[PDB]
Structure 1
Amino acid sequence: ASNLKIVRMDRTAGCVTGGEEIYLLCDKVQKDDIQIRFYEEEENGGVWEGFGDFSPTDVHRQFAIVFKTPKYKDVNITKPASVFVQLRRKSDLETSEPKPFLYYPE
């Protein structure tokens, strides 16, 4: 929808160890009721999830968030791991349409 929406991200891939800064342009969000969720449906095993590292201060005028990537689940991957990133409102867990994110082996 447009409520929560990732307009564009400056990085769509990142080192498996996480900790990398990303500029994410989004539709209006509340700095204190927003988290960036990286996740991967582990199919039969469920769903892995990691959250972008940032504070309300990194939410620029409610239309962008500069954050750092979470460490992927398996920091010893041999080849790229495809996950998803979605904006998610903390209160009611509302979600944006996901964006593909590639985690690459260090």
Structure 2
Amino acid sequence: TAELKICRVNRRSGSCLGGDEIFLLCDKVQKEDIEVYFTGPGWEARGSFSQADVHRQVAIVFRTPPYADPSLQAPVRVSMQLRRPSDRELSEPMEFQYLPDTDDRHR
């Protein structure tokens, strides 16, 4: 609320299958102690990135996690937050919208 803070992002929606690249500008974080936490009723997931994807402590380029439901029929809004494992500190939540998508290989 006073430390962890999301300042700006390149996109606020993406495929329910995950895998979209997100550029997130934030206040100073520690690459070894930071994560991007997605949440919804009874569901939680984390963005995928390496410590090398944290740029000068103030930006993170990561890939969205897949949503709980790949058969999503209509868009669904979830929360996205920076989370610090060490002390469980969380930034204020930002809205992220998962969108229907189809994988020809998955029926």
Q: TM-score range by the shorter chain?
A: over 0.9
Corresponding residue of 1:9: 9
Q: Distance in 2 between matches of 1:56 and 1:98?
A: 22
CA offset digits 1:13-71 (Å, max 9, x no partner): 0000001110000000000000000111x2xxxx2011000011000000000000000
Corresponding residue of 1:57: 52
Corresponding residue of 2:24: 24
Corresponding residue of 2:35: 35
Q: Distance in 1 between matches of 2:85 and 2:32?
A: 8
CA offset digits 1:53-91 (Å, max 9, x no partner): 001100000000000000000010110011000000011
Q: Distance in 2 between matches of 1:14 and 1:77?
A: 12
Corresponding residue of 1:85: 80
For structure 1, the 5+ residue unaligned runs are: none
Structure of larger gyration radius: 2
Instruction: Please state whether the residue corresponding to 2:98 is helix, strand or coil.
Output: strand
Instruction: Measure how far apart 1:2 and its partner are.
Output: 3.4
Moved over 4 A (4+): none
Instruction: Measure how far apart 1:101 and its partner are.
Output: 0.3
Q: Distance in 2 between matches of 1:90 and 1:56?
A: 14
* Counterpart residue type for residue 96 of structure 2: F
* Counterpart residue type for residue 5 of structure 1: K
The percentage of aligned residue pairs carrying the same residue is: 53
Q: Distance in 1 between matches of 2:11 and 2:2?
A: 21
